[PDB]
Amino acid sequence: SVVKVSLTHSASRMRVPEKRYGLAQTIESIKENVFTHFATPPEYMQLQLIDDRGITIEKNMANDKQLGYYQCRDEFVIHVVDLQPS
C-alpha cells in the first residue's frame, strides 16, 4: 500500500534517498511533492520509474495515473527529467 523510493534529477547532482508515497497517489500529486526537493515546475517534469536493478519500467508516467499502475515497489527510483526552457 505504500512504497519507499529515492529521487534523482536529470539536471542536478541532488538525490533524495528515502521517500514514501502511497501507490494510490496520482503521478500529478507526486510531482507536487517532488517540487519541494528539486523545484522544477511540475508542468516541466517527466517521471521515469527505474527499478532497483537499474532497469527502466516507464520512461514517462502519466499525470492522471496512480503510482501502483506502474507496479512500483520498494527501493525503486523515480528519476525526474527536467524539461523547463531557457
Numbering used by the authors: 2 to 87
Sentences from the paper on this structure:
Five tubulin-binding cofactors (TBCs) are implicated in late-stage tubulin folding and heterodimer assembly 1,5–10. TBC-B and TBC-E are implicated in binding α-tubulin, whereas TBC-A and TBC-D interact with β-tubulin. TBC-B comprises an N-terminal ubiquitin-like (Ubl) domain and a C-terminal cytoskeleton-associated protein with glycine-rich segment (CAP-Gly) domain.
Limited proteolysis produced two polypeptides, one of which, the Ubl domain, gave highly ordered crystals, and the structure was solved with anomalous dispersion methods 14. The N-terminal Ubl domain of TbTBC-B crystallized in the tetragonal space group P41212 with a single polypeptide in the asymmetric unit. The Ubl domain is a small globular entity consisting of a mixed four-strand β-sheet that forms a concave groove in which a single α-helix is placed. This is an example of a β-grasp fold, a common structure involved in protein–protein interactions 5–11. A pronounced hydrophobic core is present, formed mainly by aliphatic side chains. The residues involved, which have < 10% solvent-accessible surface area, include Val4, Val6, Leu8, Tyr22, Ile28, Ile31, Val35, Thr41, Met46, Leu48, Leu50, Met62, Leu68, Cys73, Ile79, and Val81 (not shown). These core residues are, in general, conserved among the TBC-B family of proteins. The surface residues are more variable, perhaps indicative of a module that does not interact directly with α-tubulin. Intriguingly, and despite only low sequence conservation, the Ubl domain of TbTBC-B contains two lysines (Lys34 and Lys62), which correspond to Lys27 and Lys48 of ubiquitin, and a structural overlay reveals strong structural similarity in terms of the positioning of these residues. A striking similarity is observed in the spatial location of two functionally important lysines in ubiquitin, and strongly supports a biological function for the Ubl domain, and by implication for TBC-B. Through reversible post-translational modification, TBC-B can influence aspects of tubulin biology in a proteasome-dependent manner.
